[PDB]
Design a protein around this ligand. Structure first.
Ligand code: KQN
Ligand code: CL
Ligand code: CL
Ligand code: CL
Ligand code: CL
Ligand code: CL
Ligand code: CL
Ligand code: CL
Ligand code: CL
Ligand code: CL
Ligand code: CL
Ligand code: CL
Ligand code: CL
Ligand code: CL
Ligand code: CL
Ligand code: CL
Ligand code: CL
Ligand code: CL
Ligand code: CL
Ligand code: CL
Ligand code: CL
Ligand code: CL
Ligand code: CL
Ligand code: CL
Ligand code: CL
Ligand code: CL
Length: 454
């Protein structure tokens, strides 16, 4: 089944590297297609005939439970657009070890591996990693920062849409994330581009391959296509307080006599500051609790109320024509990535991600917990001590003070909130352009409202 061929494919690649090095084949010689073909064939025959011991990270009980879960509850994905395919990867946050996965609805009927082989746009699940997470990390926004959701156009003149909405007005980062509003994400990424932030540095530290970093819709999944395993690794990084561990299924390959052919080497990388990662955890907790873009917390509370009280965080994504839905879930211990879609890329139903995938993944998480009762853990995500707490105006997301509004020096006061920052000084004093993005006209409208409240 999926585990047999995924493991075999990975073992063959590791055996290929080992045999080429054993036989002293040069980097140049390895560029020869006929030489590569011979070493791939030799690697396959070595595994087939060689009596090697392959040690995997797979938890057999959990992986078996996940197979039974998709066999029993995969039909919950069928939304009237034909048989819906699925991929899931369960990853240990502290190691990057893959404990189990779902390759698809039924290997016997369709062998395509939707966990490791299929690449699709991760849509709005890109936003925490590539837009908001980097902006917080660079000290360009805090947890209660205000962003523009005022109407604006892409470079080609097309309006930035959210369902049938051309946008609203100013909103908090929390509102922007809970709803997955697009314009705030667009402005956040535009700010990173304008400031010359090395976004590629962050994304490549987590193993992402993105060909063009200038794509305006990168936060909404434009110009990015990922496997479920790779994208699970991005969420692993945020859940693990910003420390990436490279995903793996193979831990070790030994000859019969115990000679080590290959052994996974942990190379932990602090991709985001502990402050950034823990602030993002708090925001993604509210994405699930708000239930705006996913019913997951309602589904899970019914199936397993004790498990629903674990510290779940996560994020949804939907591609433009509903071809792909994503739900990424973490507790402190584990991350579970989930994709659904069609092999031929045709549209799912409008609510496929919101309801069907959420219900299926609640069943999958419950199946995992029944197989391994302690595996999700009862630990909480918590702000790192390095987080800076700033008292800011709810209205501006910046500290109270004086601003020039249409000539007149205005004393900006009102309701305050604690905003979490990952810099040294926390939130700046309120300035006229207090929000991420927005036009002159937007700011005239926003300030008119705020002044009206003093
Ligand atoms: C995150 O997943 C977000 N999804 C998107 O932004 C998605 C990639 N595209 C859209 O929702 C807008 C494209 C639709 C065509 C434009 N309308 N016209 N004409 C959120 C929204 O789920
Ligand atoms: Cl399998
Ligand atoms: Cl496979
Ligand atoms: Cl040999
Ligand atoms: Cl096991
Ligand atoms: Cl896609
Ligand atoms: Cl515009
Ligand atoms: Cl909200
Ligand atoms: Cl970049
Ligand atoms: Cl990638
Ligand atoms: Cl670039
Ligand atoms: Cl591996
Ligand atoms: Cl041997
Ligand atoms: Cl840190
Ligand atoms: Cl909740
Ligand atoms: Cl609900
Ligand atoms: Cl979404
Ligand atoms: Cl689509
Ligand atoms: Cl199909
Ligand atoms: Cl705890
Ligand atoms: Cl906390
Ligand atoms: Cl503080
Ligand atoms: Cl303060
Ligand atoms: Cl600072
Ligand atoms: Cl800005
Ligand atoms: Cl304007």
């Amino acid at each position: 089944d999926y585990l047999y061929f995924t493991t075999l494919a990975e073992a063959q690649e590791r055996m290929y590297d080992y045999l080429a090095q054993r036989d002293n084949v040069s980097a140049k010689e390895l560029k020869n297609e006929a030489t590569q073909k011979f070493y791939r064939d030799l690697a396959a025959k070595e595994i087939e005939n060689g009596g090697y011991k392959i040690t995997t990270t797979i938890d057999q009980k959990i992986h078996s439970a996940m197979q039974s879960a998709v066999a029993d509850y995969g039909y919950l994905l069928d939304d009237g657009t034909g048989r819906v395919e699925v991929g899931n990867v369960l990853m240990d946050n502290q190691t990057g070890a893959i404990l189990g996965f779902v390759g698809g609805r039924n290997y016997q009927e369709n062998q395509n591996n939707h966990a490791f082989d299929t690449k699709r746009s991760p849509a709005s699940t890109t936003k925490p990693l590539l837009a908001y997470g980097i902006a917080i990390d660079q000290g360009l926004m805090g947890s209660e920062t205000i962003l523009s959701n005022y109407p604006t156009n892409f470079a080609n003149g097309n309006p930035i849409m959210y369902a049938n909405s051309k946008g609203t007005g100013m909103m908090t980062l929390g509102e922007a994330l809970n709803y997955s509003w697009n314009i705030p994400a667009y402005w956040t990424y535009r700010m990173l581009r304008e400031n010359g932030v090395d976004v590629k540095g962050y994304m490549e530290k987590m193993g992402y391959e993105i060909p063009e970093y200038g794509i305006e819709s990168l936060p909404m999944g434009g110009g990015i296509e990922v496997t479920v395993a790779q994208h699970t690794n991005g969420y692993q990084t945020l859940a693990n307080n910003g420390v990436y561990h490279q995903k793996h299924v193979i831990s070790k390959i030994e000859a019969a006599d115990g000679r080590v052919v290959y052994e996974y080497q942990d190379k932990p990388v602090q991709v985001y500051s502990k402050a950034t990662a823990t602030i993002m955890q708090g925001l993604l907790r509210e994405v699930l609790s708000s239930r705006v873009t996913t019913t997951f917390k309602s589904n899970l509370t019914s199936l397993n109320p004790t498990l629903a009280n674990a510290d779940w965080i996560g994020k949804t994504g939907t591609t433009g024509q509903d071809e792909n839905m994503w739900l990424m879930l973490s507790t402190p211990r584990l991350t579970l990535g989930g994709w659904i879609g069609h092999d031929d890329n045709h549209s799912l139903s409008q609510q496929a991600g919101y309801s069907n995938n959420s219900n299926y993944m609640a069943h999958l998480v419950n199946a995992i917990q029944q197989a391994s009762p302690s595996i999700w853990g009862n630990e909480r995500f918590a702000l790192d001590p390095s987080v800076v707490k700033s008292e800011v105006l709810k209205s501006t997301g910046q500290k109270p003070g004086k601003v020039s509004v249409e000539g007149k020096e205005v004393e900006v006061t009102g309701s305050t909130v604690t905003s979490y920052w990952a810099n040294k000084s926390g939130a700046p004093a309120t300035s006229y352009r207090f929000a991420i993005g927005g036009s002159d006209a937007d700011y005239q409208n926003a300030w008119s409202s705020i002044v009206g409240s003093l």
